């Protein structure tokens, strides 16, 4: 399924993922596309910070869901 | 003395500093805690941008003062 990630600068990125994909895997996909190291990235969905040891399905993230990316 | 630094994402960081500490030293402390390189950080206090060659006392920053961090 496709998901969207918005940046602090107003950019939107589209990613192809599976509900069984891990958050760490998602961060890795972002690194590949934007060059941002996973340790400097924070992912938020519906006001909650997503953990690297959990999956998309655990957060009930559905197709065309939009995640927010924060930089540290 | 303790000071506070707020981020663009709404996070607040507490740092231990001395009035004789330099702004560059303060940035270095932030790098250690957040991983943000000093060249990408801008510190603002009471509407003024702080320079790397000046100290906290020069800006009359007192205990429990709150600084604002900007990213470039």
Curated annotation (Swiss-Prot), chains A, B:
- Annotated crosslink Glycyl lysine isopeptide (Lys-Gly) (interchain with G-Cter in ubiquitin) location: 6, 11, 27, 29, 33, 48, 63
Role:
Exists either covalently attached to another protein, or free (unanchored). When covalently bound, it is conjugated to target proteins via an isopeptide bond either as a monomer (monoubiquitin), a polymer linked via different Lys residues of the ubiquitin (polyubiquitin chains) or a linear polymer linked via the initiator Met of the ubiquitin (linear polyubiquitin chains).
Superkingdom of the source? Answer: Eukaryota
Result when mutating residue 44 to D: Impairs ubiquitination by CRL2(KLHDC3) E3 ligase complex. Impairs ubiquitination by CRL2(KLHDC3) E3 ligase complex
Q: Which organism is it from?
A: Homo sapiens (Human)
Q: Where is this site: Interacts with activating enzyme?
A: 54, 72
Under which name does UniProt file this protein?
Answer: Ubiquitin
Q: Where in the cell is it found?
A: Cytoplasm; Nucleus; Mitochondrion outer membrane
In this chain, the site described as Essential for function is at: 68
What residues of the intact protein does this structure contain? 1 to 72 of 685
Name all Ubiquitin-like domain ranges: 1-72
Question: Mutating residue 7 to D leads to what result?
Answer: Impairs ubiquitination by CRL2(KLHDC3) E3 ligase complex
Name the consequence of residue 68 to A.
Decreases affinity for UBE2R2 in ECS(FEM1C)-UBE2R2 complex. Impairs ubiquitination by CRL2(KLHDC3) E3 ligase complex. Impairs ubiquitination by CRL2(KLHDC3) E3 ligase complex
Outcome of residue 65 to D? Phosphomimetic mutant that binds and activates PRKN
Residue numbers of (Microbial infection) ADP-ribosylthreonine PTMs: 66
The UniProt-reported impact of residue 65 to E is:
Phosphomimetic mutant that binds and activates PRKN
